[PDB]
Amino acid sequence: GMEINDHQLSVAELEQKYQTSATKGLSASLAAELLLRDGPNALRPPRGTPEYVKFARQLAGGLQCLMWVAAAICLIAFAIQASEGDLTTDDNLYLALALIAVVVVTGCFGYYQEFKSTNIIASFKNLVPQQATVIRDGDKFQINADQLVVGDLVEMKGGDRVPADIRILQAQGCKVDNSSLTGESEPQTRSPECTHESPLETRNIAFFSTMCLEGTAQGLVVNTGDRTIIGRIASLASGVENEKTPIAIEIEHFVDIIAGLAILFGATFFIVAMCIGYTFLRAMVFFMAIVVAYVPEGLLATVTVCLSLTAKRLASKNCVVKNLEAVETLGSTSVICSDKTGTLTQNRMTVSHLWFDNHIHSADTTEDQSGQTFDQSSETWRALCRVLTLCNRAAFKSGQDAVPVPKRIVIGDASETALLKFSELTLGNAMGYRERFPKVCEIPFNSTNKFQLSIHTLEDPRDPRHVLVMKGAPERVLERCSSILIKGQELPLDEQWREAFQTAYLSLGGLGERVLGFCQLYLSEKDYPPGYAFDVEAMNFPTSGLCFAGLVSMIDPPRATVPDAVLKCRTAGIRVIMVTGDHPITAKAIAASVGIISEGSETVEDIAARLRVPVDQVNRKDARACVINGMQLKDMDPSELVEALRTHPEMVFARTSPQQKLVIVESCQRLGAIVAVTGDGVNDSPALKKADIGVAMGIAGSDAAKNAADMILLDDNFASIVTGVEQGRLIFDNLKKSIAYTLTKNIPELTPYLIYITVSVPLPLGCITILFIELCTDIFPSVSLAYEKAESDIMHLRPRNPKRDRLVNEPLAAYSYFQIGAIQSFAGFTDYFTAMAQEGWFPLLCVGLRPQWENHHLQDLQDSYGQEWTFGQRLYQQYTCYTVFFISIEMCQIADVLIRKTRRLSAFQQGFFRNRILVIAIVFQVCIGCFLCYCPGMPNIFNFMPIRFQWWLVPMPFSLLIFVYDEIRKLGVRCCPGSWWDQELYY
Amino acid sequence: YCWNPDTGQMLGRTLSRWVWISLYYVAFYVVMSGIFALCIYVLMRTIDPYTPDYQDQLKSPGVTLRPDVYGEKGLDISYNVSDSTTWAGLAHTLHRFLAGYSPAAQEGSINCTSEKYFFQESFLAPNHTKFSCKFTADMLQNCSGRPDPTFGFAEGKPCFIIKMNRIVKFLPGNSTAPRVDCAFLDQPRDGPPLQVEYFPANGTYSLHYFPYYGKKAQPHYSNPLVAAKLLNVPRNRDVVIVCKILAEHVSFDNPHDPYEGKVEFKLKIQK
Ligand SMILES: CC(C)CCC[C@@H](C)[C@H]1CC[C@H]2[C@@H]3CC=C4C[C@@H](O)CC[C@]4(C)[C@H]3CC[C@]12C
Ligand SMILES: *[C@@H]1O[C@H](CO)[C@@H](O)[C@H](O)[C@H]1NC(C)=O
Ligand SMILES: *[C@@H]1O[C@H](CO)[C@@H](O)[C@H](O)[C@H]1NC(C)=O
Ligand SMILES: [K+]
Ligand SMILES: [K+]
Ligand SMILES: [K+]
Ligand SMILES: [Mg+2]
């Protein structure tokens, strides 16, 4: 079922399977029957839901389904009192359009968090060829790709990309680029032979969008459109369950807590309201006023704004997000699955070791040449360097003198590419040293030869000799060598040297690297004059008994900042997994090189050999590490996969289908994981989508990855991931300090209306001045905590448990609401009663006064000095309790923001003004509060009165209180982490 | 979604923790309640009994008229001079209003014949308070229920009662006793000015009624009244009559406060 099995079948079983011919192609008719059976050969573009219906849910939710009903209580309270002629209650038209403005701006504060939103299947139609070259009715012509059908007989040639999933029948020196399948850009030969059980390995299958590099081929289309291998890759990319992000679930958690809490409070006092005697057309205008008081309107704002002041900080260190939800995901991530090629690596074949002086010297594999150089004073070495430099046909292009040797562009294959660059580093110039020794002859690397060979005259005028240089497949370089350089001498090749060489070329062969022999020989002037008639195809020169000069080996080396980055993340408790398509034995070596595997860790295939015991006998548990190939995984249950992921802590997967990357990534997510994925290639996209954060490499990234990723490291500096963890743990711990500041004030916003409903005292805090506390004065101070530095060394902490530790947990809410908010309500009501008592109305008088207070028809209400008070003289003072409770709150939202600086330290033992942005928010909190208070026009427009200076002082012991109540608590958990003071009153 | 059962085993923790936390939280809660009450007890220990600290919403007093039959957006007094059971709901609301103004409900006050600020600084009256000055029914003379216990209402020239809003220590001035003067707001181009006649003479309020020293210092003190005998208002027309108080320390130019020194009332005298 869709399993490409056509590589196994014969030529005869094929014209039966597609009713076709082997040299004629299909019949012109049948090429349409299949097209009108299977549709065209292209990629079905999956539209998401439209661009405006993702504005439609952004206006719904737990805080958004309430602020629709309170603007529907405000336009059914500007509607039952405007048909009756009551122009005075445009306090509910001013209160309907400002709440729907809180619906849509907060709706714009959740939609403008999608920067790109680019279609992923945008970049799957750009790796594809426009036209093919087919045969039908035995005539060769040129056709559109989207006209190829299952059974079409196509011709490939190098330079064009492959136009279908095509089983090859004949092919002449044909090679492809299967990075898009393996992530590996090393040519893969193809042939009519069925060289594997899997069609992903065998050579008689060529895949849609694979760039055919060199040669020709003819074969039959076997899969089409989305049925091709690269098409299956696209179906998993777009077609991923868009699970909410970590913070999204946490956002929706406390929304559901507050959405439940706002519906208890207001709707047990609607039962109270009708049952202590208000009518229904009053009792419905208490829920509305309670919910505006309890719900923090501009909370959702302060959240997303905070996320931006991280994202910018991320961008400035060249890490750009694509939606704000990602900016935190790293700090909550437990597991990182990474591609190897051009993710941790440089995807650039480069030199690593060179066997000479019967000992393996370690070369310097870094993109900036930082690390450990090797032994270059050996006279036996400076010959080995003379052979590889000369015997090299690659070349730098003109005009790259300001380019780093690694990042230069070289003509030829990656082998000579590596050596040439290495030659440009140890030597000053690799090209000039090849011209002082001009070349007279050559044989390039052939395959009947299975080596390379060239012969040159010398730079020395006094030396007239001829020097032969050669390189080839290490074993074959030995059996045409009879002498050897050890430390400066030359020695015969006994059976003790033909054993110490077959040691090293198999030693580094366990590090999984390309190995190359090297050898030389100086042709004497007595049988080869300094102008001698060298004739190549005649083959008069000896081509044996040459002086071996030393192996060299090369590998796909890691990036400069990767092995330190990896160590930092496991030091943050994070488990790291290699997930690659590369061959197993390069992978394992790379994993220990970057530090996915730690010094001393063993496979079951490392143990069994040190004990000399077969592998089935090994106890699995013993192994610190394990390695699993593409076949093995497919042979596994997932039941066996978890037992494995459990059993061995350091894991390496390799030769993996892009299909299988995802499996692993979600097979972790099922165990409750927050999963990051870093990647660069077309193989990587589906596990970049499904990952709770996907990261792609900015430069070396293939587009399909980049358009699937949520984060983009522009500079590929992988150690950026560590900075994003730091700022995702920081933002996580810096969001719950801001929320508590925003949430504690919701209690002194609420308690007035409750009292005002029951005790029938005047309204202490009006819905207008509440909306200014929430939507202005305490916006800046709420956000300024996004600039707190950690209290514990955050990178030594394990990553949080994503079930247990939450953003708004039950203890934080209760402490801000019930305790801090109580003191904030007990300053606010201490100020409400001094302003009432110093201006005419004593305490008991307030009880039951509201009905006489809120009366247009009574312009004479005699107070507690008998003084008669007009309705405007009374409502002017109702504004002087709007504006005196309001400032009792603002005085407690300074001591708040200073005890929302620290969760474990004292503000004493770190400091008070260490955050400089915080102390700039406080002076704005204060000075928008005086602007509203004192500015002319404020009493009538915004309902704000120029209060007396003693009414700022009344809530000041209450603020000095709030600070030191939290102070004693912060020390209290320090000196005793165990006892009841820690386990119940911490947040 | 399946089935969503409750969380009865959600005693979030154990019944010893909940007695532990609860008696903590209320130990917090009541401590504050006694600190908050300690404050309002210190608050009601700084206050002064006869004089308010600040009158921040009492610069110019309000002014209020009787009979008070309201409609939407203002005072409206639209009756029937002939028909007698639609001015008996305005004639009785002026009477029962004055049922605390008679010489017997004025048994507490003393006659002031000073006609200047009634300045008192120590307490001589029955039960240690300051003295007041009478205001009686008959002083509105023809608009007091005698000789007119329908208050000019049958004769198309009724008698409203303009009532000031007394204020503690409030000095309106002492060069003159401040008067009433009720006239149209829109002077009609074909009609005449609202010719009107006040009780007692000039429509003033005597200077011996002030200063007010609280409802504790002059307990039985009564506001002085006036009664404008409105003559002109033509029959079957809707006019607007503004009843101001002109004075030294009084204004009537507050566009947010329509009952501050002036009281605007629609009036219709049908036939
Ligand atoms: C002061 C008087 C009048 C009210 C007392 C009501 C009691 C039953 C209320 C008031 C405060 C409430 C507590 C406030 C905070 C928390 C912490 C939270 O993690 C669980 C619920 C819990 C523990 C609440 C339980 C019920 C509670 C104790
Ligand atoms: C106080 O004096 C008044 C005199 O007006 C008297 O009527 C009243 O009964 C007295 N009350 C007390 C408690 O002495
Ligand atoms: C008015 O009052 C002042 C009090 O400051 C007083 O000195 C003055 O004599 C009075 N003048 C008149 C005309 O009553
Ligand atoms: K609010
Ligand atoms: K690539
Ligand atoms: K994702
Ligand atoms: Mg790659």
Author numbering:
A (entry chain A): 47 to 1033
B (entry chain B): 20 to 290
Share the article's original sentences.
To exclude the possibility that the observed single K+-binding results from an artifact of the Tyr799Trp mutation, we determined the wild-type WT(Rb+)E2-MgFx structure in the same conformation, despite its limited resolution of 4.3 Å. The β-subunit ectodomain in protomer A, and the A- and N-domains in protomer B show relatively weak density, due to lack of tight crystal packing at these regions. The N-terminal tail of the β-subunit is partially visible in the wild-type structure, in contrast to that in the Tyr799Trp structure. We could only assign an additional nine amino acids (Tyr20–Gln28 of the β-subunit) for this region that extends along with the membrane surface. However, the well-ordered regions, especially for the TM helices that define the luminal-closed K+-occluded state, are almost identical to those of the high-resolution Tyr799Trp structure. We therefore conclude that the molecular conformation of the wild-type H+,K+-ATPase is essentially the same as that of the Tyr799Trp mutant. At the cation-binding site of the wild-type, a single Rb+ anomalous peak is found at the position close to the bound K+ in Tyr799Trp, as well as at site II in Na+,K+-ATPase. An anomalous signal is hardly seen at the position corresponding to the cation-binding site I in Na+,K+-ATPase, even at the low contour level. These observations allow us to assert that the conclusions extracted for the Tyr799Trp mutant in regard to K+ stoichiometry can be extended to the wild-type protein.
The highly acidic environment (pH 1) in the stomach is generated by the gastric proton pump, H+,K+-ATPase, which mediates an exchange of H+ and K+ across the parietal cell membrane that is coupled with ATP hydrolysis. The H+,K+-ATPase consists of two subunits. The α-subunit is composed of 10 transmembrane (TM) helices, in which the cation-binding sites are located, and three cytoplasmic domains (the nucleotide (N), phosphorylation (P) and actuator (A) domains) that catalyze ATP hydrolysis and the auto-phosphorylation reaction. The β-subunit is a single-span membrane protein with a short N-terminal cytoplasmic tail and a large C-terminal ectodomain, and it is involved in correct membrane integration and targeting of the complex to the cell surface.
